[PDB]
Design a protein around this ligand. Structure first.
Ligand SMILES: Nc1nc2c(ncn2[C@@H]2O[C@H](COP(=O)(O)OP(=O)(O)O)[C@@H](O)[C@H]2O)c(=O)[nH]1
Ligand SMILES: Nc1nc2c(ncn2[C@@H]2O[C@H](COP(=O)(O)OP(=O)(O)O)[C@@H](O)[C@H]2O)c(=O)[nH]1
Ligand SMILES: *SCCCC(=O)NC1CCN(C(=O)COc2ccc(Cl)cc2Cl)CC1
Ligand SMILES: *SCCCC(=O)NC1CCN(C(=O)COc2ccc(Cl)cc2Cl)CC1
Ligand SMILES: [Ca+2]
Ligand SMILES: [Ca+2]
Ligand SMILES: [Ca+2]
Ligand SMILES: [Ca+2]
Lengths: 168, 168
């Protein structure tokens, strides 16, 4: 069976760990140590086909990192997470995408844009702005809430779909 | 001296001809026949260096065209023109960029986004939308008016600068 390496990226505090732990362990973590950077395994069936996912939840500092570059080289798809109430996190998505392009020397890398914290009653990033960003990049967009679990499986499943398409 | 093939693209009526004729002949045309497709020569000096420009003002139909693909293959830089009072023209920029990517096998070819008819207050496309689009594409954005000549030289000169960079 196919095995894929997924990487969850995004600004500090946007919900990378919360999304990943919801997927893997089916609970919401409200105080997950911000420096824990680890990989989690999950076997999934998506569109009738099984895949083993190795999901790296990233947690480095704002600095150039050779190790991060290695994670980018090994990663096959990237979840680009921002929080819908944090404009900086949305602006910085661009920079994170450029990092991936630099390391992988490619603009066709599998990626999905994820607007997390959709359960919140206020937002500073409008949905249309996010949809237009994703359209400009040629990638899917999905809104999630790690807190209510809304869209969590679909975000990761969509990324797998993007990886499969690329590998074909 | 170096010679570059430039291509001016954009939806019907956005001001491709008016922009091109302002650059070449220094006057504003009101009713230029919409099917005239032609190339114009212009020697320019940009940042102290001279270049010979061969500028194609496009005027085909909405259809796949083998001849258009040949113009894209030989084109070295593209002006992506929309009109700020024509939302369709702005939406369709994306499609026109994808056509160039198709033909050029996804090359990162020089392009500049041009928001024309900037003198008009009947705007339907927000400047911030256009800035963000250009940012996502990694290209400059220039506001122009072929009517007042605002930005006209600078749009074409910026495209030349992008070509010179690409060829380095
Ligand atoms: N309301 C809301 N809060 C969330 C959501 N996801 C994460 N959080 C909160 O944001 C904080 C940071 O989440 P975390 O996953 O640790 O961020 P990371 O630095 O991106 O890994 C968490 O403690 C939660 O308080 C969500 O979908 N909704
Ligand atoms: N007000 C204004 N009108 C313009 C501008 N550029 C073009 N036009 C007018 O828009 C119409 C279409 O221009 P044209 O250059 O023929 O468009 P093309 O089909 O893209 O070649 C004509 O009536 C032009 O005079 C501009 O910057 N401002
Ligand atoms: S939470 C405490 C502060 C630390 C912080 O701000 N870290 C940031 C998080 C975002 N970041 C990225 O580089 C995101 O993009 C990444 C990360 C990891 C990989 Cl493998 C690929 C990309 Cl594109 C910088 C540090
Ligand atoms: S006023 C014109 C009447 C008909 C019309 O709607 N023609 C459109 C204009 C836009 N178009 C494109 O394909 C634009 O993109 C182009 C054109 C030419 C080249 Cl070489 C490259 C690109 Cl990306 C369809 C026809
Ligand atoms: Ca974390
Ligand atoms: Ca794509
Ligand atoms: Ca014309
Ligand atoms: Ca660029």
């Amino acid at each position: 069976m196919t095995e894929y390496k997924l990487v969850v990226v995004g600004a500090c505090g946007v919900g990378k760990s919360a999304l990943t732990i919801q997927l893997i362990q089916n609970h919401f973590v409200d105080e997950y140590d911000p420096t824990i950077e680890d990989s989690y395994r999950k076997q999934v069936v998506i569109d009738g086909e099984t895949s083993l996912l190795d999901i790296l939840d990233t947690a480095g500092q704002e600095e150039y990192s050779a190790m991060r570059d290695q994670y980018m080289r090994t990663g096959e798809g990237f979840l680009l997470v921002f929080a819908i109430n944090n404009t900086k996190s949305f602006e910085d998505i661009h920079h994170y995408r450029e990092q991936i392009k630099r390391v992988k020397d490619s603009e066709d890398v599998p990626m999905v844009l994820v607007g997390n914290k959709s359960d919140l009653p206020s937002r500073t990033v409008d949905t249309k702005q996010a949809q237009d960003l994703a359209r400009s990049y040629g990638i899917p967009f999905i809104e999630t809430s790690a807190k209510t679990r809304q869209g969590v499986d679909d975000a990761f499943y969509t990324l797998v779909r993007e990886i499969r398409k690329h590998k074909e």
